[PDB]
UniProtKB/Swiss-Prot annotation:
The protein's name: Heat shock protein HSP 90-alpha
Written domain comment of the UniProt record: The TPR repeat-binding motif mediates interaction with TPR repeat-containing proteins like the co-chaperone STUB1.
Entry's localization field: Nucleus; Cytoplasm; Melanosome; Cell membrane
Gene name of the record: HSP90AA1
Part of the intact protein present: 16 to 224 of 732
Organism listed in the record: Homo sapiens
The family this protein is said to belong to: Belongs to the heat shock protein 90 family.
Amino acid sequence: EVETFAFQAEIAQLMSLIINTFYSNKEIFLRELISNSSDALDKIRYESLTDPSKLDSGKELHINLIPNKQDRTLTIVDTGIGMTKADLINNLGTIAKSGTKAFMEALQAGADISMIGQFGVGFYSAYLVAEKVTVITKHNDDEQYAWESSAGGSFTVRTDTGEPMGRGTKVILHLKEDQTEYLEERRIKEIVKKHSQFIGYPITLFVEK
Ligand SMILES: OCCN(CCO)c1nc(N2CCCCC2)c2nc(N(CCO)CCO)nc(N3CCCCC3)c2n1
Ligand SMILES: [Cl-]
Ligand SMILES: [Cl-]
Ligand SMILES: [Mg+2]
Ligand SMILES: [Mg+2]
């Protein structure tokens, strides 16, 4: 079964502002998702220091970037702490309420979309380049879930039946027709060097073949 939920009103409003505002500096989306992945890897490494069994689900701590020109997708894979069902459906949302509300105050008072990260809501910057986002995730304490939204006020959560990951998150960006530059090898490398040169984990760009 697939469950369907409404976004909270303020998040539906942020998503609509990110989709509708003319704004050319779209490349900042990659920094925000790599920064989220780095947070998740920090959390599992920290927890593993007092409880080594947390790494039984896998020891490697990395980020892979996987462009696919045929499917028009860009996938960010990490082996971080992953997210529970309750994270996906409400807990990460309730923590976002205040950053979302403040970011939207800041934008009306002159701030631009590139400061989204400073409010803890960088994930939604995905919607600068993607018409749909799929988030496949596995936390030690829960089962594998797929989250998915094409915006429009709702999102879905289902149990995931495909290729089981051990622990961590796959973000699948279904790119807009005019945003294929972000599948180009030299553009991904330019963006990673410019915005995220200082991440404490290996970032491997997979080449297509
Ligand atoms: O890059 C996107 C994928 N990842 C996985 C990285 O492994 C990711 N990580 C987040 N975090 C770091 C790993 C522990 C959880 C936090 C995180 N945090 C929040 N929120 C808390 C704010 O800090 C709400 C605001 O976005 N929301 C996320 N979303 C995306 C899917 C669920 C819905 C909203 C989210 N997503
Ligand atoms: Cl993760
Ligand atoms: Cl609908
Ligand atoms: Mg990510
Ligand atoms: Mg990810």
